[PDB]
Design a protein around this nucleic acid. Structure first.
Ligand SMILES: Nc1ncnc2c1ncn2[C@@H]1O[C@H](COP(=O)(O)OP(=O)(O)NP(=O)(O)O)[C@@H](O)[C@H]1O
Ligand code: SF4
Lengths: 834, 760
DNA sequence: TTTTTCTAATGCGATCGCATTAGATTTTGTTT
């Protein structure tokens, strides 16, 4: 005959095995049938059945895309045809008619001109199988006298979700138990004994319906609203942590059921691993960094020799691994042997150490070159006869097998190594050397994967009004959903009923307040407060932060300090007052020098800087500076060309254009507009020098200055740019600058750089104060700011400024004034004045 | 049936028949209370369902507060006898392009580019342009003109080919004309207009790369959504069959791309059975530089007609509920000569900036301690006026994620790992509250770092492989332990062994390294110990949301990316995330206070050249990226005629007078910032203005405002060589650590956490 | 050791060009 047994958990698939033994099967999933024989061989599908009856996806995806390109469309869709987002709306129209058995001619009876063109495209696709029309073809193939007699018992076991073209592959063979469960989408058998739900949980479900419960269960249903998305993700990781640790139900008994895992369930699994709670857990194979370590050795072997940029990627990878501060120790110890005065690149020097043997200096950096020689000898002396040969000749893979044992950081890192290393071996055997390279815990999950789990504790997250009733419309161009029903709030309410059915111990429904949906208020009348803005946690780095917050505050202090005493006795980093941040001490608090015969050494370019802020001086000098700043090394290439005494005007321009190509500019339209801007900055010099050659006379160019300005006695060290000699015997001072914006005349005579050069001209190293110029190459001619000759009174007014400032570099606790240069300083984030 | 009686002036907006309708909602009259009482009347009296309702606002804050009064007044409508859809403007066009997106063929897979990642994509189409730009400027200064024309062509719907022929028929009126008396300045006007047409092939290679990657902008959304409605008249047909009552809020800020999208769809003369209501006042239209449409309040009534030629009606709805008199007599006189709203001050002038802050810190501390908000135009200006009020004793809430001292110690120390040449993020580490180095041990690491270290050779440095004597390889090789102190050598060795471990976790996946550095640091335990007990357990809000931006980004190289991405966010975005509080005196700006109310309101700095902000103002004839008004939409913005000029004394007199009309019009956008500041009061009001500034050599007086408000209050306290004060700082826990040291429902947790620690 | 913005004004003098420079270098949302 044909019998049927139409609630959650009520003993249906367990009853179908008792009939399947007492006389001595169809599940619908390749995972559900694994456990289905685990209950049969302990007592003792559809899409895999119609395949054998017809025996006795991206390849499919490209076929629609190619025929759309060559092609009775209504001519409004003619721009859309060359796209790749029209080949998915058209693919899913032919899929929602194959599940319902509609001929391509049968769609043409429905016409609405848009469906008639799909009705012509579908019969054009037959003339040119898949995993969708497999059941629909075995029904069209149908032997049935031999087939139906071969079977003594038919057990379909799951008919609540089963397509109508699959409903007539069973009914053709219609022994014949038709089990089903008619709510959560012939003699009749009903069931009421839940067998898998508490009477508090079962009354929550059937309250929403407008079957009894297991009386041996103890259950509770609760609803908790949070106040922010961050606080909502913490009380979940609280509740999964209270329950395992205080109550005691283990992991792999808890689950977080979400509506849709991209919108919520990916941002929530990050905010829940941080609280110590495990998640059982995607990425390509080419982007896997441990996989492409050894694929480069394939890439090098198929080209005969290793390049420059492809050989540094082996040092920054897992084969021979260097940190970023032992490249800087290799590069200094490889430019010391091949010591050309303009030194080479680092790619061109790295090949000459792998190939031959560098024997000038190597102690520990030779071992990191042997494990690159020995791999690149096994690549020289089927390709998988060399893949494993290159693998084994390295010292690699004997590391992590002696390191996947221990380690919480390297431990999962070593397991993802071999799981990505082995998954690249199996891509090689499926190819069968240039072709192999050219071709290459809590279960958080959705509602449609939450139908095959036991799950004591269940948390339904994200039950808010934006996404649990999806008001997100699904209109389109082709109009699929208007076709799917001619050929919703109440529908999504079943999913919230079919989610709470999987919980036997407890149910937690969680939203935010971003509003509560009108489903959570319908739980409150059957369930057993303001929203939470600051939620309690049970992490050991969460208690020690709160206990320290009350014991350092403007009764509870005596309670908290006893708890921090027992935390510090076993571990818990952050509890001992030897580990607090506000309880550390300075290292020295001793001055920079003593023994008062000491003589400091100034320099005239850092003397306005040292009267402007002394903390700025201590941390730009003595390390701490952002880097190279290419506008400096162009403005110093010009000071070199101008400083030569025997070159003409065309001699200088030709020597700048030859060297300019080695300057790291992006935007090669800007590397040309900065050369023509710096050709004219050499024209402006010789136009100026010949204009004032009648007034001044050169003495020397780029003079080193080193003497004793005062005798703590100061010491002046610098390089004067270009010293001149006036017609009255005086000695003016020229400081050629390459900026655009000149300094004002009110600041042109308090200029602390020129006022130390002419102070060094007086008293030896002449002996007249002379003057001072400041020539701005860049912006009649090049603008110049002038400074007067010195008096015997303004000298002493300036000599006390040098000596008073030079003693502010000695002692500790430097001043930090707020200047006009705060907006352009590197050391700003560690400034106490900010 | 359960509420208050409506006003007689509100009994015409509520009982208005279906059809287009305008409400000129004045200052503080509460256009949300009197709007949910029309969704109810258009349901209880028939005419709709509660699922045929659409409500559109700009911000998402003013959208979530409209669900909470539609849903409330409808649950009490079902008490005596489907939910309405409320969404923003820019999220209503993302919906409109996922359904009908393939007609005008834009992909439905199209990701929305962020402000920071949009800058990352146009910087690389400027640094890879094969040509001869010949522009005095730099890259990273001409890619902020690409992003400001292409954000202003996709806002007036120009299509990039009308811009190529604008420099002609003005460059010939300068040369082909004769004088009446090229002038060397009018050529400089003409230099900027031959600069747009040199960066038209730059912004058109930006659009062709935003289609080979299928990504868009927020202003690119309304460009494609505006065109689709006008081109295909079937989109509006299937939207007037779904929504039968539509609400439009703060419509005075609606631009021009949001105007011909909402006028082709919802009734440009389409269906008279649709009840359509747009609200907003023309007199709080304070933006003007962001959505910029000076129309939409005059050109609404002739734009949404009765479909038979008759224009729509317009309703006054002017009443003030959260506003007392004697603060209306000012605000009606401010907006005079520019129906006056009717109901249902202490002016001053000091001669020092630092002492005028004492005057407002008197009243803000005398009425607080006797038993309020300060509206400052510039945020940078707001910071100083929080220490002059902290010393008085009033708690202060002034309203950058990358400048938070727990995130900024995690951006750095993630930069010492990657590149040991950023030296400015080594002094952040060595001088911070962990391992406090002294001055003598910093200056002895630098001597170690030097001892480890011609035109053809100067260019040899400043190469990418150049050896520069950095500090961070004197940590990993400090030398001999006789240069440091015995306390300062024990920390360098310790620091070295921390970085050698963290640099091996560098080829690992990227959000598993930001959560690994943060554990080695003392973060998430020192971030909560610096939080008061009254907060709760909340300490790590803005440190968790850093790591919900590293893992969104890395869906990552950790050296090439996150250091180029975070540093481009500092300049371009000035902080990726602000981070909200639990939520005193609020010292918010004048743009962040649109829609709020307080008790005592202080508008502190009404000096000249400060509130009006006349300085740093430019128009279309002195910069390239400013879109001339011949083709600009809503062309207000008066355009020079160019056709009545036959002498050079005529031309440069048109230009020098059109340059005053386009700047008179920016003084008019200032008086609308008084009116959106004065009326935010509910009680007494504090107006003031200094005389001597802060960094001048010549004083600036009061503005045109403070010289006018003295004549308004009189027809009023009589409060009517700068400075050389230089701020500088020399470079409980000790009480609390006595208790924890001398000791050796919180107690049940510690006994539970030790059940996992003492059990393998 | 020494180095690095740009605009639009505000005054000059033989109207308008060349020069100095003194004031600043705004405010700020909008999808999944
Ligand atoms: N008499 C019983 N003896 C033992 N276990 C029982 C009994 N009655 C019910 N159960 C349990 O109840 C569960 C039966 O699951 P089952 O009825 O197959 O699930 P379902 O909710 O009907 N879904 P499905 O199996 O896909 O049809 C198992 O965990 C059984 O152990
Ligand atoms: S911000 Fe001020 S104190 Fe700090 S380095 Fe710069 S000038 Fe010196």
């Amino acid at each position: 005959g044909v019998v049927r047994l139409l609630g959650p958990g009520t003993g249906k698939s367990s009853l179908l095995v008792d009939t399947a033994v007492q006389h001595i099967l169809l599940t619908g999933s390749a995972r559900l049938r694994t456990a289905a024989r685990a209950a049969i061989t302990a007592r003792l599908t559809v899409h895999s059945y119609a395949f054998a009856v017809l025996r006795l996806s991206a390849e499919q995806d490209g076929i629609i895309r190619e025929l759309l390109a060559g092609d009775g469309w209504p001519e409004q869709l003619w721009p859309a045809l060359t796209t790749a987002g029209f080949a998915t709306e058209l693919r899913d129209l032919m899929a929602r008619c194959t599940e319902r058995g509609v001929d391509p001619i049968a769609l043409q009876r429905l016409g609405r001109p848009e469906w008639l063109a799909a009705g012509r495209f579908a019969q054009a696709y037959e003339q040119i199988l898949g995993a969708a029309e497999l059941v629909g073809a075995a029904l069209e193939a149908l032997l049935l006298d031999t087939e139906r007699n071969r079977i003594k018992l038919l057990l379909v076991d799951d008919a609540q979700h089963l397509d109508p073209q699959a409903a007539r592959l069973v009914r053709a063979l219609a022994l014949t138990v038709i089990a089903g469960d008619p709510d959560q989408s012939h003699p009749a058998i009903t069931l009421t004994q839940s067998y898998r739900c508490a009477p508090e949980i079962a009354s929550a479900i059937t309250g929403l319906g407008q079957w009894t419960g297991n009386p041996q269960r103890e259950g509770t249903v609760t609803v908790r609203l949070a106040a922010s998305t961050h606080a909502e993700g913490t009380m979940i990781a609280d509740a999964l942590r209270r329950a395992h640790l205080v109550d005691g139900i283990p992991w792999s008994q808890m689950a977080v059921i979400v509506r849709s895992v991209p919108r919520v369930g990916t941002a929530l699994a990050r905010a829940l691993t941080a609280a110590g709670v495990p998640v059982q857990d995607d990425v390509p194979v080419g982007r896997q960094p441990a996989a492409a370590a050894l694929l480069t050795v394939l890439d090098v072997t198929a080209t005969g020799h290793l390049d420059a940029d492809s050989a540094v990627a082996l040092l920054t990878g897992p084969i021979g691994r260097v940190d970023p501060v032992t490249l800087r120790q290799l590069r200094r110890a490889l430019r010391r042997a091949d010591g050309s005065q303009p030194p080479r690149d680092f790619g061109d020097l790295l090949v000459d150490a792998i190939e031959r043997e560098p024997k000038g200096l190597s102690a520990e950096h030779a071992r990191t070159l042997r494990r690159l020689r020995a791999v690149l000898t096994a690549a020289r002396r089927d390709p998988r006869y060399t893949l494993w040969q290159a693998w084994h000749a390295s010292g690699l893979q004997r590391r992590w097998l002696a390191a996947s044992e221990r380690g919480g950081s390297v431990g999962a890192q070593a397991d993802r190594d071999l799981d990505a290393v082995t998954t690249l071996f199996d891509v090689a055997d499926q190819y069968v050397l240039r072709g192999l390279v050219d071709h290459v815990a809590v279960a958080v999950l959705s509602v449609h994967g939450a139908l095959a789990g036991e799950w004591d504790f269940v948390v339904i997250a994200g039950v808010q009004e934006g996404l649990w009733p999806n008001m997100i419309p699904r209109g389109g161009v082709l109009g699929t959903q208007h076709l799917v029903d001619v050929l919703l709030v109440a529908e999504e309410r079943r999913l919230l009923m079919a989610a709470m059915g999987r919980a036997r111990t407890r149910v937690m429904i969680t939203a935010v307040d971003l509003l509560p949906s009108p489903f959570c208020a319908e739980i409150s009348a059957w369930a057993t407060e303001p929203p939470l803005v600051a939620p309690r946690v049970l992490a050991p780095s969460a208690l020690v932060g709160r206990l320290r917050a009350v014991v350092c505050a403007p009764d509870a202090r005596a309670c908290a300090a006893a708890q921090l005493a027992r935390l510090a006795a076993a571990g818990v980093p952050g509890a001992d007052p030897s580990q607090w941040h506000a309880m550390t001490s300075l290292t020295t608090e001793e001055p920079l020098w003593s023994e008062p015969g000491h003589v400091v050494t100034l320099s005239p370019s850092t003397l306005q800087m040292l009267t402007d802020c002394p903390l700025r001086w201590l941390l730009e000098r003595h390390g701490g500076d952002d880097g190279r700043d290419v506008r400096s090394t162009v403005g110093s290439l010009v000071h070199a060309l101008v400083s030569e005494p025997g070159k003409t005007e065309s001699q200088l321009v030709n020597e700048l254009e030859k060297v300019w190509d080695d300057l790291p500019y992006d935007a090669k339209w800007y590397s040309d507009n900065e050369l023509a801007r710096h050709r004219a900055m050499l024209e402006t010099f010789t136009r100026w020098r010949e204009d004032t050659r009648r007034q001044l006379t050169e003495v020397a160019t780029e003079i080193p200055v080193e003497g004793i300005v005062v005798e703590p006695g100061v010491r002046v060290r610098g390089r004067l740019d270009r010293l001149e000699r006036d017609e009255a015997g005086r000695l003016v001072v020229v400081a050629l600058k390459t900026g655009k914006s000149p300094v004002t005349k009110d600041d042109a005579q308090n200029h602390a750089q020129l006022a130390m050069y002419q102070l060094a001209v007086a008293a030896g190293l002449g002996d007249e104060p002379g003057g001072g110029k400041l020539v701005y190459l860049g912006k009649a001619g090049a603008t110049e700011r002038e400074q007067d000759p010195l008096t015997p009174d303004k000298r002493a007014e300036w000599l006390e400024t040098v000596g008073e400032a030079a003693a502010a570099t000695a002692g500790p606790r430097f001043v930090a004034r707020v200047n006009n240069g705060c907006a352009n300083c590197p050391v700003r984030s560690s400034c106490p004045a900010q | 049936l359960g509420l208050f009686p409506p006003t007689d002036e509100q009994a015409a907006v509520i009982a208005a028949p279906p059809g287009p309708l305008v409400v000129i909602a004045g200052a503080g009259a509460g256009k949300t209370e009197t709007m949910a009482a029309r969704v109810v009347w258009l349901v209880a009296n028939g005419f709709a369902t509660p699922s045929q309702v659409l409500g559109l606002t700009f911000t998402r804050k003013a959208a979530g507060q409209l669900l909470r009064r539609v849903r409330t007044r409808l649950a009490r409508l079902a008490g005596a006898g489907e939910s309405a859809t409320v969404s923003t403007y820019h999220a209503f066009a993302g919906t409109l392009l996922r359904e009908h997106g393939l007609l005008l063929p834009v992909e439905p897979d199209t990701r929305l580019l962020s402000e920071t990642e949009l800058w990352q994509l146009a910087y690389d189409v400027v640094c890879a342009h094969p040509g001869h730009l010949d522009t005095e400027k730099t890259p990273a200064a001409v890619t902020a003109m690409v992003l400001r024309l292409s954000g202003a062509l996709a806002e007036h719907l120009v299509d990039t080919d009308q811009l190529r022929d604008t420099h002609v028929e003005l460059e010939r009126l300068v040369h082909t004309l004769p004088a009446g008396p090229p002038s060397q300045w009018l050529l400089r006007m003409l230099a900027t207009q031959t600069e747009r047409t040199e960066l038209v092939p730059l912004i058109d290679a930006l659009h062709q790369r935003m289609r080979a990657e299928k990504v868009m902008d927020f202003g690119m959304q309304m460009a494609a959504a505006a065109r689709l409605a006008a081109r295909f008249p079937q989109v509006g047909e299937q939207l007037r069959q779904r929504f039968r009552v539509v609400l439009l809020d703060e419509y005075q800020d609606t631009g021009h791309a949001q105007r011909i999208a909402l006028s082709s769809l919802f009734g440009g003369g389409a269906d008279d059975g649709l009840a359509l209501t747009a609200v907003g006042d023309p007199i709080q239209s304070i933006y003007g530089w962001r959505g910029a449409s000076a129309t939409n309040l005059p050109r609404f009534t002739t734009d949404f007609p009765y479909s038979d030629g008759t224009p729509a009606p317009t309703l006054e709805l002017r009443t003030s509920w959260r506003n007392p008199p004697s603060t209306l007599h000012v605000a009606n006189a401010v907006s005079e000569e520019a129906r006056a709203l009717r109901p249902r001050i202490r002016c001053a002038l000091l001669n020092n900036v630092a002492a005028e802050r004492d005057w407002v810190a008197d009243h803000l501390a005398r009425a607080y301690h006797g038993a309020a908000a300060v509206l400052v135009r510039r945020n940078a200006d707001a910071a100083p006026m929080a220490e002059a009020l902290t010393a008085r004793g009033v708690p202060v809430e002034v309203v950058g994620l990358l400048a938070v001292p727990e995130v900024a110690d995690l951006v750095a120390m993630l930069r010492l790992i990657a590149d040991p040449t950023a030296g400015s993020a080594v002094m952040r580490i060595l001088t911070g509250p962990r391992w406090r180095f002294g001055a003598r041990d910093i200056a002895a690491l630098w001597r170690r770092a030097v001892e480890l270290d011609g035109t053809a050779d100067i260019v040899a440095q400043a190469a990418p492989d150049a050896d520069t004597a950095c500090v961070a390889d004197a940590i990993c090789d400090p030398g001999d332990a006789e240069r440091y102190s015995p306390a300062g050598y024990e920390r360098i060795v310790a620091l070295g062994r921390e970085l050698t471990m963290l640099r091996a976790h560098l080829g690992h996946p990227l959000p598993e390294l930001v959560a690994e550095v943060r554990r080695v640091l003392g973060l998430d335990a020192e971030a909560r110990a610096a939080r008061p007990v009254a907060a709760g357990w909340a300490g790590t809000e803005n440190l968790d949301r850093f790591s919900d931006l590293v893992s969104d980004f890395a869906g990552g190289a950790s050296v090439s990316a996150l250091l180029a991405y975070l540093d481009a966010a500092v300049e371009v975005e000035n902080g990726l995330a602000p981070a909200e509080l639990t939520v005193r005196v609020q010292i918010l700006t004048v743009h962040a206070a649109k829609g709020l109310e307080w008790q005592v309101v202080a508008v502190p700095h009404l000096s000249a050249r400060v509130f009006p902000s006349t300085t740093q103002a430019r128009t279309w004839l002195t910069d390239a990226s400013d879109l001339p008004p011949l083709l600009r939409g809503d062309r207000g913005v008066p355009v020079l005629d160019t056709s009545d000029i036959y002498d050079r004394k005529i031309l440069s007199d048109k230009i020098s007078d059109h340059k005053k009309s386009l700047d008179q019009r920016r003084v008019d956008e200032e008086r609308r910032l008084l009116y959106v500041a004065i009326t935010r009061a509910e009680d007494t009001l504090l107006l003031s203005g200094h005389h001597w500034g802060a960094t001048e050599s010549k004083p600036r007086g009061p503005s045109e405002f403070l010289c006018e408000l003295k004549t308004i209050l009189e027809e009023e306290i009589e409060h009517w060589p700068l400075r050389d004060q230089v701020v500088e700082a020399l470079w409980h826990v000790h009480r609390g650590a006595q208790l924890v040291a001398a000791a050796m429902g919180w107690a049940a947790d510690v006994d539970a956490l030790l059940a996992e620690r003492e059990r393998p």
